[PDB]
Amino acid sequence: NDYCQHFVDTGHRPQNFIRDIRLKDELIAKSNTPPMYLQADIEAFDIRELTPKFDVILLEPPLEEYYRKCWTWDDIMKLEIDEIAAPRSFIFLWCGSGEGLDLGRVCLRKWGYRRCEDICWIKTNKNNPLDPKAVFQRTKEHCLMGIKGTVDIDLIITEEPEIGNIEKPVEIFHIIEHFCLGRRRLHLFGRDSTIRPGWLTVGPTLTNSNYNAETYASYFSAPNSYLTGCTEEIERL
Amino acid sequence: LFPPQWICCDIRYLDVSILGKFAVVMADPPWDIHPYGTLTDDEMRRLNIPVLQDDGFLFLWVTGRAMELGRECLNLWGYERVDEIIWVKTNQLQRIIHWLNHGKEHCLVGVKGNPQGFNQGLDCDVIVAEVRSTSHKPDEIYGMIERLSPGTRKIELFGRPHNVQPNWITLGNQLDGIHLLDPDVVARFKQRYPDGIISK
Ligand SMILES: Nc1ncnc2c1ncn2[C@@H]1O[C@H](CN(CCNc2ncnc3c2ncn3[C@@H]2O[C@H](CO)[C@@H](O)[C@H]2O)CC[C@H](N)C(=O)O)[C@@H](O)[C@H]1O
């Protein structure tokens, strides 16, 4: 059965027809720092104030293409991500499906990472059967994984969200957390709706803030400076 | 011609200028990713892709670090990457098969020049199709390529015998001999290769 032909015939995307650990999530949840968040206009904001250096950065700038303030790849590329990333650390960069697939890789290289996974968010249209340069209908987005220093699959499948909904699948958080990469986790351009235990969310649309660098850093003082996020908390007194 | 045509060769040494111009180029190169016969990064860069097209599309399979290197070659060869096809690899029951398990392979889409009269936007950028033998890419890509550019000349690089299709010329070192029917090509091949085959 040719699902490409079927989509030409009927409009049902080929991905519509793809068919179809607990203890770990529990250790992740016990290990999680309280959610912390900070309203900041990131164009105007000195990210160096975000300390300590992060083990994981999730970067979700609002691209023009999500809306059919927007950030161009010009703005993104000028972010000083490398000044807040721990010497060994990871980045997850949402790149969309256009030129971001190329310009996001330049970014990763500019900030000192190499790509090790290309995670694809494939969008079904079961409930509802173009860029000028596009050759094809674009039905997916890419989240690039980068590493600097020395169970899950690289696909997320969900239904296409309603128009004007720019939220990315919460599954990206489970994939990141299941890598057990460290507990300093930063979400740049997160939102009220994305705040989440074990994460520091920084974005311009947050309506409240509770971030305090000293308080935040106290979650990772000894004996907890090197925990992976997937181990039992270290016993005290 | 129109039926399948092919040329067993080493694509490094074939004077591909004898083949003329194609509306679409597809390639599945044996990138030297860190087992069974590869091309070095420099050999890949030096491939004489630029003579194959004036205006049209390149389809370039990539995996691993070829995702970045293939973008280099793609740009060096004179293309702009305008799309990226994802083949979701399934079994016969439509279930998906370092840090993450890989459920897919990638096919970069480059444009060169200004193509006109292609039916852009008929297919979507996701393929869902059954894994066959190792490295055997899905046949759906030929239907997508045919709807996009019906009846035009097309050329596949690093094809195996099962890759040969109508309107395509397949080059690869595991093809059986030389099978050419387009008289223009037959004439240019006999001029350049009177005694049959050469190197460097
Ligand atoms: N100098 C030369 N001149 C002319 N021909 C040459 C020259 N050298 C070599 N050849 C011939 O090219 C052909 C190349 N085939 C190999 C193409 N690449 C790849 N190899 C290996 N794994 C690949 C891969 N792609 C994707 N994966 C996936 O990745 C994982 C492991 O990496 C796995 O999960 C894989 O699944 C082309 C296949 C052809 N499209 C089909 O559809 O069968 C083959 O015949 C060679 O002799």
Residue numbers in the entry:
A (entry chain B): 117 to 136, 153 to 200, 209 to 269, 275 to 295, 309 to 395
B (entry chain A): 368 to 401, 405 to 467, 474 to 576
How do the authors describe this structure?
The complex of methyltransferase-like proteins 3 and 14 (METTL3-14) is the major enzyme that deposits N6-methyladenosine (m6A) modifications on messenger RNA (mRNA) in humans. METTL3-14 is the catalytic complex that transfers the methyl group from S-adenosylmethionine (SAM) to the substrate adenosine. The METTL3 MTase domain has the catalytically active SAM binding site and adopts a Rossmann fold that is characteristic of Class I SAM-dependent MTases. METTL14 plays a structural role for complex stabilisation and RNA binding.
In the METTL3-BA2 and -BA4 structures, the SAM moiety is superimposable with the METTL3-bound conformation of SAM, and adenosine is bound in the presumed catalytic site. A crystal structure with a BA representing the transition state of methyl transfer shows a direct involvement of the METTL3 side chains E481 and K513 in adenosine binding which is supported by mutational analysis. The METTL3-BA2 structure reveals that there can also be a hydrogen bond formed between D395 and the N6-atom of adenosine in the case of the non-alkylated RNA substrate. The BA2 structure further shows that adenosine is stabilised by additional hydrogen bonds from its N7- and O2’-atoms to the METTL3 side chains of E481 and K513, respectively. Taken together, adenosine swaps conformation from solvent exposed in the METTL3-BA4 structure to buried in the METTL3-BA2 structure where it forms hydrogen bonds with residues in the active site loop 2 (ASL2, METTL3 residues 507–515). The crystal structure of the complex with BA2 reveals a string of ionic interactions which involves charged side chains of METTL3 and the amino and carboxyl groups of the SAM analogue. The string consists of seven charged groups (four of which are positive): R536+ – SAM COO- – SAM NH3+ – D395- – K513+ – E481- – K459+. In BA2, the adenosine-N6 is situated, through the alkyl chain of the linker, at 1.9 Å away from the carbon corresponding to the Cε-atom of the methionine moiety in the SAM cofactor. Strikingly, the angle formed by the SAM-5’S – Cε – adenosine-N6 in METTL3 is 160.9° which is similar to the other MTases, and very close to the optimal 180° for an SN2 reaction in which the adenosine-N6 attacks the SAM-Cε and SAH becomes the leaving group. Hence, the adenosine of BA2 is in a suitable orientation for methyl transfer and BA2 represents a transition state mimic for METTL3.
